[PDB]
Design a protein around this ligand. Structure first.
Ligand SMILES: CCCCC[C@H](O)/C=C/[C@@H]1[C@@H](C/C=C\CCCC(=O)O)[C@H]2CO[C@@H]1C2
Length: 295
């Protein structure tokens, strides 16, 4: 419309969310992590199959609505960062062409894994350059693009810096709080944060993503209330939903969920090996990073 290439933060988000949703828990976690960290699509089982589908979908190599491998997106991804990656146009074309040969069949995890596997095995190194899948390569993207949220920087802090960039002091100068001012700066910060946390995107509200954050603080029983508060919220701007949550009977639980996601948004690896403890632990962890926490 046309398709927009993914930056280093967008790619890192895809990888970490797919780890969160597909890694097993307990003793088997490390086995899969070691292989996937090495960009090995192994072992050949349904855990890996659906992990692969997750990443292909998130990187938008596979489109679930068309049930199609989107070959022409590969050169777009390449072109957007070619002066940084130095990937070769010849290889990019070959990767594109290999994807054009791929048969998605039913679109199931295994069908996508089976189709993509030889393409992956042939073009793994190139794919890691194009889709910001190396530490060194991603670092070059961040260095060239200071307007991308960095590792170690929370979305709340990144967004604060862009919302209050004039003469007016940040409302969060002594630390972020939940004071509702309705200021244009606060509304901007909250839109930026809601988009960064994937609460909202170009298609609007994701009720399930806000619910996920309550589940992550062990408040699964609040799901119907979370849904009700969002549903009854008049207004469709990020700030409107934020006000609805903050002024509801969910207030403290929302603060805890949102603060935990602040931490997680600063450290995309947080959950990959660590679970929610309590609000005090979250605050201590945030002090180590570039966040909006009170010192
Ligand atoms: C279709 C799936 C192909 C395989 C993808 C692969 O398993 C990607 C793994 C990611 C890897 C990507 C590597 C480097 C990205 C930059 C990391 C950084 O800036 O510290 C590691 C981070 O997130 C997981 C962990």
């Amino acid at each position: 419309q046309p398709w927009k290439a993914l930056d280093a933060e967008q790619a890192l988000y895809v990888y970490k969310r797919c780890y969160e949703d597909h890694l097993p828990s307990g003793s088997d976690r490390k086995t899969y992590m070691t292989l996937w960290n090495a960009w090995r699509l192994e072992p050949n089982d349904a855990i890996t199959h659906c992990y692969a589908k997750c990443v292909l979908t998130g990187l938008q190599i596979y489109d679930p609505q068309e049930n199609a491998f989107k070959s022409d997106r590969i050169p777009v991804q390449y072109q957007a960062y070619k002066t940084i990656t130095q990937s070769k146009q010849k290889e990019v074309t070959e990767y594109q062409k290999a994807l054009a040969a791929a048969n998605a069949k039913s679109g199931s995890c295994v069908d996508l894994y089976n189709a993509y596997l030889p393409v992956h095995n042939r073009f793994v190194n190139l794919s890691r350059q194009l889709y910001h899948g190396t530490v060194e390569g991603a670092a070059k993207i961040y260095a060239a693009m200071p307007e991308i949220k960095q590792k170690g920087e929370s979305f709340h802090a990144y967004c604060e810096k862009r919302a209050w960039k004039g003469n007016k002091q940040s409302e969060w100068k002594n630390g972020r709080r939940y004071k509702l001012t309705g200021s244009p700066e606060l509304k901007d910060a909250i839109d930026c944060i809601f988009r960064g946390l994937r609460y909202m995107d170009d298609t609007g509200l994701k009720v399930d993503e806000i619910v996920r954050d309550f589940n992550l603080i062990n408040k699964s029983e609040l799901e119907p209330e979370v849904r009700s508060v969002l549903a009854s919220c008049k207004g469709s701007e990020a700030y409107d939903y934020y006000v609805c949550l903050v002024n509801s009977r969910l207030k403290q639980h929302f603060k805890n969920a949102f603060d935990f996601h602040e931490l997680r948004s600063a450290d995309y690896a947080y959950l990959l090996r660590k679970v929610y403890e309590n609000p005090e632990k979250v605050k201590e962890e945030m002090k180590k990073l570039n966040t909006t926490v009170h010192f």
